[PDB]
Ligand binder design. Structure first.
Ligand SMILES: COC[C@H](c1cnn2cc([C@@H](NC(=O)/C(F)=C\C3CC3)C3CCC(F)(F)CC3)nc2c1)N1C[C@@H](C(F)(F)F)NC1=O
Lengths: 98, 98
């Protein structure tokens, strides 16, 4: 066990023009800290071209990143957690299919 | 102070095809947990077009996300931290300039 103390009191539209734009989706888990995680969902299957139209010869893909979260241990505990890895979507990029 | 206990013991080649590709940069901070954060740096100023060439009519931009990290409190403490917000580049997207 590597138990440390953590003080949870935190110290102190641009991407709308993307060819692979995204919206935010609320992921809520009461057994986790942070309980609310905003994930990116690509608006389209294709990428928006210069004309403002969707081109399906390319794909908008979510960028999946491993992040660390705190899991309540034992369950429902207000003050004790275990570090845990989860995969979250942090944005979208445009890719040329294989 | 909202002090909790945390047990720190936990129980990419597709994005190479991006029109706004990026490389990973190691961001190391001994006063922070995680000490190592992999940050995205856009490979080009422009985006890769259908011909496979870097096209400057569009821009590769880094996607910045606010990320929570643990800051050693007091400084150099091996087992006590305070939650803190930083901005991290997690990937690149292609945008149409304004
Ligand atoms: C300011 O709140 C932004 C929020 C968010 C959500 N969850 N979250 C997890 C982490 C961890 N840090 C990391 O995972 C980390 F530092 C680095 C890895 C490499 C990027 C922490 C957790 C607490 C800790 F006490 F466990 C120390 C670790 N921070 C965050 C930040 N966001 C951001 C955006 C998202 F998709 F990117 F998540 N959507 C969100 O909802």
């Amino acid at each position: 066990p590597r138990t440390v103390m953590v003080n949870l009191n935190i110290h102190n539209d641009y991407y709308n023009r993307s060819t692979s734009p995204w919206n935010l989706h609320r992921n809520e888990d009461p057994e986790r800290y942070p309980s609310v995680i905003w994930e990116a969902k690509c608006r389209h299957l294709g990428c928006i071209n210069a004309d403002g139209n969707v081109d399906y010869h390319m794909n908008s893909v979510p960028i999946q990143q491993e992040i660390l979260v705190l899991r309540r241990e034992p369950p429902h505990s207000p003050n004790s957690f275990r570090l845990e890895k989860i995969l979250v979507s942090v944005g979208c990029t445009c890719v040329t299919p294989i």
